[PDB]
Structures are given as C-alpha cells and as structure tokens.
Amino acid sequence: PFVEDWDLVQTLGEGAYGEVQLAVNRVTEEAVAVKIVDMKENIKKEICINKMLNHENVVKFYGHRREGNIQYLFLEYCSGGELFDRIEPDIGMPEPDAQRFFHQLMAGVVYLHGIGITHRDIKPENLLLDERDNLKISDFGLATVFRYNNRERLLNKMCGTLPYVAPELLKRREFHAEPVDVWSCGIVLTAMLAGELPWDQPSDSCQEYSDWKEKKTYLNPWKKIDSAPLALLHKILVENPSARITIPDIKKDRWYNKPLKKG
Numbered sequence: 001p002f003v004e005d006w007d008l009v010q011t012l013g014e015g016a017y018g019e020v021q022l023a024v025n026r027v028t029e030e031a032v033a034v035k036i037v038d039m040k041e042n043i044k045k046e047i048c049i050n051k052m053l054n055h056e057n058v059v060k061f062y063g064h065r066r067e068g069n070i071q072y073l074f075l076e077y078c079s080g081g082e083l084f085d086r087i088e089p090d091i092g093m094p095e096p097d098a099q100r101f102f103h104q105l106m107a108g109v110v111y112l113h114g115i116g117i118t119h120r121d122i123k124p125e126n127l128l129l130d131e132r133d134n135l136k137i138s139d140f141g142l143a144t145v146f147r148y149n150n151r152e153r154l155l156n157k158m159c160g161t162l163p164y165v166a167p168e169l170l171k172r173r174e175f176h177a178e179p180v181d182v183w184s185c186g187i188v189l190t191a192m193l194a195g196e197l198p199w200d201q202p203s204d205s206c207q208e209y210s211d212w213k214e215k216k217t218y219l220n221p222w223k224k225i226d227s228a229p230l231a232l233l234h235k236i237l238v239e240n241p242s243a244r245i246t247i248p249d250i251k252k253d254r255w256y257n258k259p260l261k262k263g
C-alpha cells in the first residue's frame with residue numbers, strides 16, 4: 001500500500017529476496033524503488049554494504065525503515081529497466097551499445113573493488129538502466145568484503161548464478177574475489193554481443209565449456225562475435241584465475257579502446 005509518505009505503485013520484481021516496488025511520493029511525485037523484505041541478519045549486512053556505496057554506476061541507497069517483521073530499503077529507481085531486456089535473444093545488441101554498457105559496468109566494478117567489496121552475482125538481470133540509459137549495478141544481497149585494512153581475504157562460499165560463475169568457484173576450496181567478478185563481466189559481454197549464454201556452467205561435464213577450452217570458436221555463440229571483442233573474451237574467460245586478465249589490463253584492450261558509433 002504505502003510506507004510513511006510513499007505509495008507503492010508497481011512491482012519491479014519479486015523472488016527469494018522479497019519484492020521491489022516503485023514508490024511514489026504523493027506530495028512531491030518523486031519516484032524511488034523500495035525493496036520489501038520479510039524478516040523471516042542477512043539484510044543487516046546488505047544494508048551496511050549499501051551505506052558505503054557512492055558511485056554513478058551503482059544503485060544508490062537512500063536509507064531503510066523497519067516496520068515489525070518488514071524491512072524497507074529505499075533505493076534509486078532506474079526507469080530504463082533491466083539490461084536483460086535490451087538483449088535480443090540470439091542476436092544481442094549493437095556493438096557500440098554493448099561497448100558503452102561494458103565501459104560503465106567496468107567503472108562500477110572498479111569502484112566496488114576499490115572499496116574492497118565484491119558483488120558476486122553480476123548478470124544482466126541485476127544491471128539496471130536510468131532515464132539516460134546509464135548502467136547501474138544492483139542487488140548487494142550476495143556482496144561481501146574481500147579487502148579490509150589493506151588485507152585481502154579469500155572467498156570460500158558458493159554463491160552466484162551458474163552460467164555466470166567462474167570455474168574456480170566450483171573447483172577450489174578458496175579463491176580470489178576479483179577474478180570471479182571479472183569472469184561474470186565477460187559472460188555479460190558475451191550475452192550482449194550474441195544474445196545467448198555460452199554454457200550452463202563452467203565445468204568439464206559441460207560440453208559447451210569444453211568446446212570453448214579447445215578453442216572451437218567456429219561454434220555459437222563465438223561465431224557471432226567480431227574478432228576484436230572476441231579477442232577480449234579470450235582474455236577474460238581464461239580458466240586459471242591467475243592467468244585471467246585484470247581490470248587494469250582490460251582497460252588497455254584494443255576493443256575496449258576502439259571508437260564505435262552506430263549506423
């Protein structure tokens with residue numbers, strides 16, 4: 001119905017996380033997003049993490065309010081919707097659009113990693129667009145601290161979404177946070193340029209993944225991707241996280257720096 005001065009007008013999504021509604025102030029007409037969670041900390045950590053975020057490519061956190069067993073997180077509304085909906089199945093989107101979104105995604109991720117936070121569930125469904133089609137990273141429910149007091153801590157928990165998770169997450173007891181988020185970004189880039197995900201999961205039991213390791217790029221989705229961006233994907237989707245390209249080096253990539261124009 002409504003929270004304090006805000007009216008909940010439309011459902012922007014629902015799942016195990018609860019539900020997200022578009023809240024409109026009856027007085028000012030201002031619009032924000034409200035995440036409603038049933039208590040039925042988990043949310044405490046998410047709240048603490050959101051409180052430390054301040055970046056143009058990260059969904060802003062305005063505050064929260066508790067009402068019994070119900071917790072309300074006030075977040076930045078993104079009228080452009082989910083990046084997922086800009087990906088035409090089997091087609092993808094124009095390369096210039098994909099490059100722009102990728103640059104913005106990198107900016108957001110560099111920001112997070114800079115403050116010692118890893119997102120852990122980067123995928124098109126969690127990447128939102130504002131009124132100017134600027135990309136914003138959302139959903140910090142799986143986010144965690146991987147660097148504190150200049151000391152890195154390896155991760156061990158299994159979390160994320162199979163098609164987007166890095167292989168080491170499935171094979172190693174402990175692993176570095178950063179290369180996992182980098183890998184997810186590479187899968188997102190693949191989806192944007194091909195309109196399809198490369199594999200159900202990055203395992204040996206997965207034929208699609210095995211095909212990629214053997215470099216069978218004459219197959220989909222790789223055959224749909226231009227040589228320049230494909231060269232970047234060859235550097236990102238590297239099984240060994242230690243050999244995987246880092247963000248500083250992604251920013252030096254030929255395709256990343258290629259001027260593109262639609263149309």
Ligand SMILES: COc1ccc2c(c1)C(=O)N(c1nc(C(=O)Nc3cnccc3N3CCNCC3)cs1)C2
Nearest residue numbers: 012013017033075076077078079081125126138139
């Ligand atoms: C215009 O159409 C839409 C459609 C969907 C959405 C919006 C606009 C919009 O602003 N949404 C917003 N979602 C958030 C947010 O923090 N969401 C969010 C937070 N916590 C867990 C899950 C979340 N979402 C589930 C749905 N996919 C995106 C992430 C902030 S704004 C979701």
